[PDB]
Write an enzyme that holds these catalytic residues in place. Structure first.
Site, PDB file in Angstrom:
ATOM      1  N   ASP A 229     -54.806 -40.313   0.346  1.00 50.67           N
ATOM      2  CA  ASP A 229     -55.808 -40.537  -0.683  1.00 50.67           C
ATOM      3  C   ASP A 229     -55.844 -42.031  -0.986  1.00 50.67           C
ATOM      4  O   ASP A 229     -55.028 -42.804  -0.480  1.00 50.67           O
ATOM      5  CB  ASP A 229     -55.492 -39.708  -1.937  1.00 50.67           C
ATOM      6  CG  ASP A 229     -56.663 -39.614  -2.897  1.00 50.67           C
ATOM      7  OD1 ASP A 229     -57.713 -40.227  -2.623  1.00 50.67           O
ATOM      8  OD2 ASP A 229     -56.535 -38.926  -3.930  1.00 50.67           O
TER       9      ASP A 229
ATOM     10  N   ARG B 120     -65.107 -56.605  -3.122  1.00 51.73           N
ATOM     11  CA  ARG B 120     -66.453 -56.134  -3.445  1.00 51.73           C
ATOM     12  C   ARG B 120     -67.230 -57.300  -4.048  1.00 51.73           C
ATOM     13  O   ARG B 120     -67.333 -57.468  -5.265  1.00 51.73           O
ATOM     14  CB  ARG B 120     -66.401 -54.938  -4.386  1.00 51.73           C
ATOM     15  CG  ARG B 120     -65.380 -53.890  -3.989  1.00 51.73           C
ATOM     16  CD  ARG B 120     -64.896 -53.108  -5.193  1.00 51.73           C
ATOM     17  NE  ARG B 120     -65.936 -52.220  -5.700  1.00 51.73           N
ATOM     18  CZ  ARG B 120     -65.956 -51.723  -6.932  1.00 51.73           C
ATOM     19  NH1 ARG B 120     -64.988 -52.027  -7.783  1.00 51.73           N
ATOM     20  NH2 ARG B 120     -66.942 -50.922  -7.312  1.00 51.73           N
TER      21      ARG B 120
ATOM     22  N   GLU C  48     -67.130 -55.056 -13.966  1.00 51.07           N
ATOM     23  CA  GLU C  48     -67.539 -55.874 -15.103  1.00 51.07           C
ATOM     24  C   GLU C  48     -66.396 -56.076 -16.087  1.00 51.07           C
ATOM     25  O   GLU C  48     -66.295 -57.139 -16.713  1.00 51.07           O
ATOM     26  CB  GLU C  48     -68.735 -55.230 -15.798  1.00 51.07           C
ATOM     27  CG  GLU C  48     -69.991 -55.212 -14.950  1.00 51.07           C
ATOM     28  CD  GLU C  48     -70.918 -54.071 -15.307  1.00 51.07           C
ATOM     29  OE1 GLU C  48     -70.463 -53.127 -15.983  1.00 51.07           O
ATOM     30  OE2 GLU C  48     -72.100 -54.115 -14.905  1.00 51.07           O
TER      31      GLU C  48
ATOM     32  N   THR D 283     -57.162 -43.669  -4.500  1.00 50.66           N
ATOM     33  CA  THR D 283     -56.881 -44.082  -5.869  1.00 50.66           C
ATOM     34  C   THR D 283     -55.587 -43.456  -6.365  1.00 50.66           C
ATOM     35  O   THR D 283     -55.399 -42.239  -6.275  1.00 50.66           O
ATOM     36  CB  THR D 283     -58.036 -43.716  -6.794  1.00 50.66           C
ATOM     37  OG1 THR D 283     -58.225 -42.297  -6.799  1.00 50.66           O
ATOM     38  CG2 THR D 283     -59.297 -44.407  -6.343  1.00 50.66           C
TER      39      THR D 283
ATOM     40  N   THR E  14     -61.013 -39.153   0.342  1.00 48.43           N
ATOM     41  CA  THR E  14     -61.042 -39.496  -1.070  1.00 48.43           C
ATOM     42  C   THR E  14     -62.377 -39.037  -1.642  1.00 48.43           C
ATOM     43  O   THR E  14     -63.386 -39.001  -0.936  1.00 48.43           O
ATOM     44  CB  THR E  14     -60.841 -41.009  -1.255  1.00 48.43           C
ATOM     45  OG1 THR E  14     -59.598 -41.398  -0.662  1.00 48.43           O
ATOM     46  CG2 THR E  14     -60.766 -41.375  -2.718  1.00 48.43           C
ATOM     47  N   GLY E  15     -62.373 -38.668  -2.922  1.00 46.18           N
ATOM     48  CA  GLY E  15     -63.589 -38.253  -3.594  1.00 46.18           C
ATOM     49  C   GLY E  15     -64.300 -39.389  -4.301  1.00 46.18           C
ATOM     50  O   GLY E  15     -65.130 -39.159  -5.186  1.00 46.18           O
TER      51      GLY E  15
HETATM   52  F1  BEF Z   1     -58.154 -36.458  -1.844  1.00 41.86           F
HETATM   53 BE1  BEF Z   1     -59.210 -35.478  -1.242  1.00 41.86          BE
HETATM   54  F2  BEF Z   1     -60.606 -36.100  -1.475  1.00 41.86           F
HETATM   55  F3  BEF Z   1     -59.158 -34.086  -1.878  1.00 41.86           F
HETATM   56 MG   LIG Z   2     -56.219 -38.913  -6.963  1.00 42.93          MG
END
Ligand code: BEF
Ligand SMILES: [Mg+2]
Length: 929
Positions: A345, A517, A421, A347, A580-581
């Site tokens: 993952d 970024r 920001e 984050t 990752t979501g």
């Molecule tokens: F970390 Be996965 F997007 F479930």
């Molecule tokens: Mg997480």
């Protein structure tokens, strides 16, 4: 549908809804024996020794002592129940240390723990406090009513979510009914209605809700009534049911034990057929012989495997290099040694989710966080040309944002849905000009620094949009009365519209190759009449021509040692992925800034309505329809990166990887966005460190960060697998060597091999004389912990399965054939086999077997410690003082003979010279490094 009345306490307290208590232990008291027994008695090498033990109930098949076939079965049952009972009580303990968190309740007027929380109680949660359950906002401390929840662990999003209170019911204190829809798996959808008196229904949506592992911000308190609790939450509905996990070494042991059973059955049939099919019961014979040959391996293997797994769990969870690591499933500590696909993952796992503006670049020169005094002395003179350019850049950074601050006693905290920001404004105050109270409904922005307090009023705003990637406002100074159009956004949108510059593209590429970024900046000087010409009114007029001051480089901070960890885990043959979501562009920036994508090495991208970078919908539809072809494509790409994935797709990716290739999948993460993939992987690893640790609560292992997975996989797991393989090798060798000695006695003398080792001797060999040096092998490692970093290639050498393969099993079988044949035949030749020399020959055979095992143990030791040189000597001395004093009837002899000692030396040298010379030549033709 679900209707909740906060006042009617008993109707939900007693019943009608799920309690807030969570369960991580799998076995309850009422189904502790059937579930565990039926799980343990599917595989062959457990059912085999169970059948062997149950055979002795029949009096015809009685091979000997009943205190040798019923007591080790009781011992393995005791050890197994103890292991899973300790695991269940520890899981319950771990769950209750997070179920007792205190939360203020309005109606209760006294803080009650999270386990005691029910549905519908008005909880007043503070700023830095983890959300108890699925809350719904009904009143917020801010007059506007907006609250920025921090969904870093409910999903993978790295941005704060704008959650406003219900506008009709914030001003209310009264009791109001909540009616929400029935739960689903929709982590991004919420439906419901708020009911008030006089039939005034109100609309509810995702914009006025808080979910399970979320963290509140942007307030001091808020009155929120719990709607979903327990297993009905959106967090729990995205978690699949946990399944039992058996290591791949368990399956290898199962297969080689199956064919070991076939081998000993063939040997028994051969012995009985060579005997002459006499005694009128050939079947009773072959069963008795089979029980004789197959009661020393299949039950010693279980005790050795189980207590070695306990040793591995203790040695994992008591390492100073990996502090605060927890083993929650002790049945699989050797799967970590053969991992070829890792699904990570982003984050919390990789990134700290605390971004800081690293470098500011303007006018072909760049200023970083280092040497920030120059921009400070530039900005304090706000109230040659590069000085005014820097001043205007800092002014823009402090004006163009959408940060809405709030006030405390000191140490002002910022709140904005886009934390870039927030990093910008923190950078501005670190320079010296600090953002202060901003209206955002009326027109006012306060700022001050080491000089005098500034003041700016905006005129109109343009909200940030996903497909626009633009953020700009028009602002006028109070002191100078000048109209500035002040506008910012992404590089690609503005490279054709900002100016006729020349050096922009090179710098944008240079910092984008660093994974920052980047936001390119712009400013336009205006007067009044053109402003009310604009106000008379599409987007063409508001963007005509700008002036490029510079651009901002905002980094996403990684956790400790993600560079080295990713490099080492890719140097060890593990194909690291990243699911990752969270959004796509920040995922790409994190991947480039973590060296997950190296220099050059073009990246492909799929988004449906070398490298890879795929959206969640595309990956979901592919694994729903095009499984085999797409997975055959992606196994050759060095890295596959997924974005915007519900935990179901990460779990399904783990399932597909372990199903199409049949390989082991590790899945590290934290929070409930990766619980399912942790549960559905062959190994689950959790991460702690923040207000939510539920992924670690549902995981097989637990480490405090990502740097520790390197030691958890490359050193602890590899050593665990190697030690278990050597343990099984030695156990099966000792069982086969005693079986071969018995069979050779049977062929050389027609009576029975059962008569060879009768009474104490066979039980002693099976349990007492040999259990200790195998666990001496259990505490040995080839390479140290300090050198698991310099040599990640040692992890690759286990991917074939050479430790427990059919070829090496048959090499063990042939070695046992040779050595046992030598022992028995040389004993017969040196003892002149009769019915009077039987005691002398069984004595020399048993002594040869014991010293053969105690020398074979010392042969395959990599490094010598004091827990191994002592164990061998202890067992040898135990045998020496146990021959006369315990038995005194079996295997008796003169034993103080020069001829006997020379015969023992010969019969042992012939047995131990082939293995010594084979390992010597394998060492001198395949040196290690
Ligand atoms: F970390 Be996965 F997007 F479930
Ligand atoms: Mg997480």
């Amino acid at each position: 549908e679900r209707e909740i009345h906060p006042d009617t306490t008993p109707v939900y307290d007693r019943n009608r809804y799920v309690s807030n208590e969570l369960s991580n232990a799998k076995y309850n008291a009422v189904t502790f024996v059937p579930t565990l027994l039926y799980e343990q008695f599917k595989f062959f090498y457990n059912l085999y020794f169970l059948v062997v033990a149950l055979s002795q109930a029949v009096p015809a098949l009685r091979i000997g002592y009943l205190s040798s076939y019923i007591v080790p079965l009781a011992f393995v049952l005791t050890v197994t129940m103890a292991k899973e009972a300790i695991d269940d009580i520890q899981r319950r303990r771990r769950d209750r240390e997070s179920n007792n968190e205190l939360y203020h309740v309005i109606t209760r007027n006294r803080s009650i723990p999270s386990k005691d929380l029910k549905v519908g109680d008005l909880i007043k949660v503070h700023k830095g406090d983890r959300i108890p359950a699925d809350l719904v906002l009904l009143q917020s401390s801010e007059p506007s009513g907006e609250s920025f929840i921090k969904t870093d662990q409910l999903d993978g999003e790295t941005d704060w979510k704008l959650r406003v209170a219900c506008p009709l019911t914030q001003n209310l204190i009264n009791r109001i009914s909540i009616t929400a829809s029935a739960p689903e798996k929709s982590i991004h959808k919420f439906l419901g209605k708020v009911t008030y008196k006089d039939s005034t229904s109100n609309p509810l949506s995702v914009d006025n809700t808080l979910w399970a592992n979320t963290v509140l911000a942007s307030s001091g308190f808020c009155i929120a009534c719990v709607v979903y609790t327990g297993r009905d939450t959106r967090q729990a509905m995205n978690t699949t049911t946990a399944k039992v996990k058996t290591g791949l070494l368990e399956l290898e042991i199962n297969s080689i034990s199956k064919i070991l059973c076939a081998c000993v059955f063939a040997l028994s049939i051969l012995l009985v057929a060579f005997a002459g099919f006499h005694n009128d019961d050939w079947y009773i014979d072959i069963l008795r012989y089979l029980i004789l040959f197959s009661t020393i391996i299949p039950v010693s293997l279980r005790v050795n495997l189980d207590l070695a797994k306990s040793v591995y769990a203790h040695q994992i969870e008591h390492d100073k290099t990996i502090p605060e690591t927890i083993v929650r499933t002790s049945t699989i500590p050797e799967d970590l040694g053969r991992i070829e696909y890792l699904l990570s993952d982003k984050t919390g796992t990789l990134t700290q989710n605390d971004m800081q503006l690293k470098k500011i670049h303007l006018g072909t020169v760049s200023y970083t966080s280092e040497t920030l005094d120059i921009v400070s002395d530039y900005v304090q003179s706000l109230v040659k040309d590069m000085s005014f350019r820097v001043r205007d850049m800092i002014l823009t950074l402090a004006i163009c944002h959408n940060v809405t601050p709030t006030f405390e006693d000191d140490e002002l905290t910022y709140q904005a849905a886009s934390p870039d920001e927030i990093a910008i404004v923190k950078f501005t105050e670190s320079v010296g000009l600090s953002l202060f109270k901003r209206d955002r409904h009326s027109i006012s922005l306060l700022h001050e620094h080491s000089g005098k307090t500034l003041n700016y009023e905006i005129l109109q705003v343009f909200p940030f949009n996903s497909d626009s990637k633009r953020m700009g406002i028009i602002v006028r100074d109070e002191q100078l009365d000048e109209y500035w159009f002040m506008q910012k956004g992404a590089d690609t949108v503005m490279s054709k519209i900002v100016e006729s510059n020349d050096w922009l593209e090179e710098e944008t590429g240079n910092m984008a190759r660093e994974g920052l970024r980047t936001l390119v900046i712009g400013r336009k000087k205006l007067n009044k009449k053109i402003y009310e010409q604009f106000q008379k009114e599409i987007t063409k007029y508001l963007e005509h021509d700008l002036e490029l001051l510079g651009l901002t480089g905002v980094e996403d901070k990684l956790q400790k040692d993600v560079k080295s960890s990713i490099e080492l885990l890719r140097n060890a043959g593990i194909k690291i992925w990243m699911l990752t979501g969270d959004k796509v562009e920040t995922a790409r920036c994190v991947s480039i800034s973590a060296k997950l994508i190296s220099r050059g090495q073009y990246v492909h991208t799929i988004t449906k309505v070398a490298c890879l970078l795929i959206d969640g919908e595309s990956l979901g539809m592919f694994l729903k329809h095009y499984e085999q072809e797409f997975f055959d494509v992606v196994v050759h790409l060095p890295t596959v990166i997924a974005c915007r994935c519900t935990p179901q797709q990460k779990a399904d990716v783990a399932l597909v990887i372990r199903k199409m290739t049949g390989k082991r999948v590790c899945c590290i993460g934290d929070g409930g966005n990766d619980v399912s993939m942790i549960q559905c992987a062959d190994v689950g690893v959790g991460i702690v460190g923040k207000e939510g640790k539920q992924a670690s609560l549902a995981a097989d292992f637990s480490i405090t960060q990502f740097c520790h997975l390197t030691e958890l996989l490359l050193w602890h797991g590899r050593n665990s697998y190697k030690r278990s393989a050597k343990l099984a090798q030695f156990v099966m060798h000792r069982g086969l060597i005693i079986a071969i000695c018995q069979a050779v006695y049977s062929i050389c003398s027609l009576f029975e091999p059962i008569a060879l080792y009768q009474g104490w001797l066979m039980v002693g060999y099976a349990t007492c004389y040999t259990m200790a040096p195998v666990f001496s092998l259990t505490l040995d490692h080839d390479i140290e912990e300090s050198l698991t970093k310099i040599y990640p290639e040692l992890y690759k050498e286990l991917t074939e399965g050479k430790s427990l393969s059919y070829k090496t099993f048959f090499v063990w079988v042939l070695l046992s054939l040779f050595q046992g044949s030598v022992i028995q035949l040389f004993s017969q030749a040196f003892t002149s086999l009769l019915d009077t020399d039987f005691t002398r020959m069984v004595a020399i055979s048993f002594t040869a077997l014991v010293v053969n095992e105690l020398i074979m143990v010392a042969l395959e030791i990599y490094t010598w410690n004091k827990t191994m040189l002592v164990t061998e000597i202890a067992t040898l001395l135990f045998y020496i003082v146990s021959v006369p004093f315990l038995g005194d009837y079996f295997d008796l002899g003169y034993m103080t003979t020069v001829n006997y000692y020379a015969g023992l030396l010969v019969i042992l040298l012939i047995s131990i010279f082939p293995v010594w010379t084979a390992k010597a030549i394998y060492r001198r033709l395949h040196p290690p490094s």
